[PDB]
Curated annotation (Swiss-Prot), chain A:
This is Radial spoke head protein 4 homolog A. Belongs to the flagellar radial spoke RSP4/6 family. Functions as part of axonemal radial spoke complexes that play an important role in ciliary motility. Essential for triplet radial spokes (RS1, RS2 and RS3) head assembly in the motile cilia. Disulfide bonds: none annotated. It comes from the Eukaryota. Component of the axonemal radial spoke 1 (RS1) and 2 (RS2) complexes, at least composed of spoke head proteins RSPH1, RSPH3, RSPH9 and the cilia-specific component RSPH4A or sperm-specific component RSPH6A, spoke stalk proteins RSPH14, DNAJB13, DYDC1, ROPN1L and NME5, and the RS1 complex-specific anchor protein IQUB. Interacts with RSPH1. Interacts with RSPH3B. Interacts with RSPH6A. Interacts with RSPH9. The gene is Rsph4a. Expressed in the trachea, ependymal cells and oviduct (at protein level). Abesent from sperm (at protein level). Expressed in brain, kidney and testis. Disruption phenotype: Mice show hydrocephalus and the tracheal and ependymal cell cilia show clockwise rotation motion instead of planar beating. All three types of radial spoke heads (RS1, RS2 and RS3) are missing in the tracheal cilia. The chain holds residues 206 to 256 of 716 of the full protein. It comes from Mus musculus. It is found in: Cytoplasm, Cytoskeleton, Cilium axoneme.
Swiss-Prot record, chain B:
The gene is Nme5. SMART domains: NDK. It comes from Mus musculus. The keyword Cytoplasm applies. This is Nucleoside diphosphate kinase homolog 5. PROSITE patterns: NDPK_LIKE.
UniProtKB/Swiss-Prot annotation, chain C:
It comes from the Eukaryota. Disruption phenotype: RNAi-mediated depletion in the ependymal cilia results in a near complete central pair apparatus loss and alters the ciliary beat pattern from planar to rotational. Multiple radial spokes proteins, including those in the head, are markedly down-regulated in the cilia. This is Radial spoke head protein 9 homolog. Its main location: cytoplasm.
Length: 51, 201, 241, 239
């Protein structure tokens, strides 16, 4: 539903005081580093790009 | 289907055992046209595995020569995703009967890499349900869209799984063993409706 | 050829057979560490050696963090003392259109155009032509930021074995996907792709500027190139192709 | 060490100097290509050399998909005919403790202290692999499937934590492995560097003859043991 879409977007938009960034922009930057043409084995390195 | 979701359709590209040694050039063709490689499997198609894969065609049409042909060598299977993947794959692939397709569609894949009907260049899925069946049979546990949300999956469990689950949970109550995951797993591997009983020695 | 992996790169084993002595090798490790010290470079690659007629012209390039600027290249004669070359432009590189052949030794040799043409300016402009036309980059080594600053890919794997033989999996190391592909090449077929030691090495030997050698293995991290040759452009190439 | 480091001739550049020959470099390249062909190993490493009296032992090891699996080590004398060594048990480990003497060669040799030469080779191989095998920090990634894989985004070890000694693990069953700071006795590793900061040299002193190269900025690592084939218990007298 669209109400669940808005609730989950508000949940992803919530920031953390211990890091200063939220989950949405963190996953957006992770997807930015993913979507350049890496060979298709990024499943093991999706953590290491997040660090 | 709706606005905030998307439909990335899939199709199966089959590389016949006559043309598996020339795989890099046709791979250049299919990657350069726009089709993407999801996962490539190098599989030896057994004669007893080709019939269950081809219940749609071989189960009603008498053709054992192609069944012997799929076991004559290696077979490469790949999943493709593209905008209008079925239509563009049919346009690039062309129609069958490659003796006629050498004269009607000279830029097709079967005109160059094919010889005849039974010794075909490739094989492609026609319908979306046929594509889903082909992908579900050849490939491992991957997710094919649409996810059947709502009452579609509940009917699937309630007429495919949950009778057996009800008969399993009925005997699991009396008596009550500790750690009942052992009892449920042994009941499902033992009292299987789709798998026969096994007795090791 | 990177300065930190000069001994870790198969130079003589690349198949071109124009490599270095142990004297020149140890001189490059010490002297490229020196030009990494006094010239503030992010990383220094050994570009190659021009054979010349009476002496050898050892050429090395250094790069900043921007990774797409024109290179502050360096030259040496005895392969020990290196000094900066002047930056190149199109009007200065036009000046040697009336002369041809090999160039020898000291930079103070005057060439006849009569305007006296220095050896040094011909050398650095020829270095600019070999950098612009050939010495390709591999695919996946240069990823793109939204800004103009390009970083070298630390997560570069980056070439599968099915894409080794293809022309389109190599771009020109030149500011202009990211860069111009190798299928935009004149003439068609001006690169020799060659399989040495099986899948453990590939060479993209340039035929427009021989003997340029591009240095793989796949599954690596080298990602290198080297030009050792006579120095002039192969205008004879479409006849022999 | 892999065959890639056999191409660069990095055993001599580590500084141990017992080294390898282009004879044996080409022989290990072609024959370890054969070992990767016949036995379906994920990676095949030239383990090293055991010093002989009538013939020279050449040892290589193969690994499965799990990087901490028990390896199928192999031996060869003429550097082409690789043959599979049996796995080692503890019963063969305490059997060879009564034999003190140099490795001879000719693997059907018999010790009167019977005891076969191949059993001594296999137990010595398991002793060196359990003691002084070396894996740096972040080279191996513990997957949640239960197996160990090579970390392919392994950035090499920075120069600050090369000399701690808390940045090198063991290539066996236990940052999920046991470090080098708990080795008995302490200071039993020759901490060294090559020319510049281009390569880090670690030499075992509980077994004199293993050398570990490590380039601090690239993904280059591996251990080669070429040496006597003996565990010196004289090491506390040395330090």
């Amino acid at each position: 539903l669209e109400v669940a879409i808005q609730n989950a977007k508000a949940y992803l938009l919530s920031t953390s005081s211990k890091s200063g960034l939220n989950l949405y922009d963190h996953l957006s930057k992770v997807l930015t580093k993913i979507l350049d043409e890496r060979p298709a084995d990024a499943v093991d390195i999706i953590e290491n790009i997040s660090q | 289907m709706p606005l905030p979701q998307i439909y990335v359709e899939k199709t199966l590209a089959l590389i016949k055992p006559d043309v598996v040694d020339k795989e890099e050039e046709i791979q250049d063709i299919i990657l350069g046209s726009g089709f993407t490689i999801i996962q490539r499997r190098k599989l030896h198609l057994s004669p007893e595995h080709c019939s269950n894969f081809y219940v749609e065609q071989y189960g009603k049409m008498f053709f054992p020569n192609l069944t012997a042909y799929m076991s004559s060598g290696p077979l490469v299977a790949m999943i493709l995703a593209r905008h209008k993947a079925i239509s563009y794959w049919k346009e690039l692939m062309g129609p069958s009967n490659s003796l006629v397709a050498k004269e009607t569609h000279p830029d097709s894949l079967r005109a160059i890499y094919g010889t005849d009907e039974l010794r075909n260049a490739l094989h492609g899925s026609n319908d979306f349900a046929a594509s889903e069946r082909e992908i579900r049979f050849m490939f491992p546990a991957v997710i094919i869209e649409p996810i059947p949300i709502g009452q579609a999956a509940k009917d699937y469990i309630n007429l495919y799984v949950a009778p057996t689950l009800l008969q399993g949970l009925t005997e699991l109550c009396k008596e009550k063993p500790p750690d009942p995951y052992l009892w449920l797993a042994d009941w499902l591997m033992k009292n299987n409706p789709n798998k026969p009983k096994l007795c090791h020695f | 050829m990177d300065a930190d992996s000069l001994l870790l790169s198969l130079e003589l084993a690349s198949g071109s057979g124009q490599g270095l002595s142990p004297d020149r090798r140890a001189s490059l490790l010490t002297s490229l560490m020196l030009v990494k010290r006094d010239y503030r470079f992010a990383r220094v690659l050994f570009w190659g050696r021009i054979l010349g007629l009476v002496a050898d012209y050892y050429i090395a390039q250094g790069l900043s963090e921007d990774q797409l600027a024109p290179r502050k290249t360096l030259y040496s004669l005895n392969c020990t003392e290196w000094s900066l070359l002047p930056p190149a432009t199109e009007e200065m590189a036009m000046q040697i259109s009336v002369v041809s052949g090999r160039f020898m030794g000291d930079p103070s040799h005057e060439y006849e155009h009569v305007v006296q043409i220095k050896e040094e300016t011909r050398l650095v402009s020829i270095i600019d032509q070999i950098d612009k036309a050939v010495a390709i980059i591999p695919r996946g080594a240069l990823f793109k930021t939204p800004f103009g600053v390009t970083h070298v890919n630390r997560t570069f794997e980056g070439l599968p074995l099915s894409e080794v033989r293809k022309l389109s999996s190599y771009f020109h190391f030149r500011e202009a996907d990211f860069l111009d592909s190798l299928e935009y090449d004149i003439p068609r077929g001006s690169w020799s792709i060659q399989m040495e030691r099986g899948n453990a090495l590939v060479v993209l030997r340039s035929l427009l500027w021989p003997g340029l050698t591009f240095y793989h293995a796949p599954r690596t991290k080298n990602y290198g190139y080297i030009y050792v040759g006579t120095g002039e452009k192969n205008m004879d190439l479409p006849f022999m192709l």
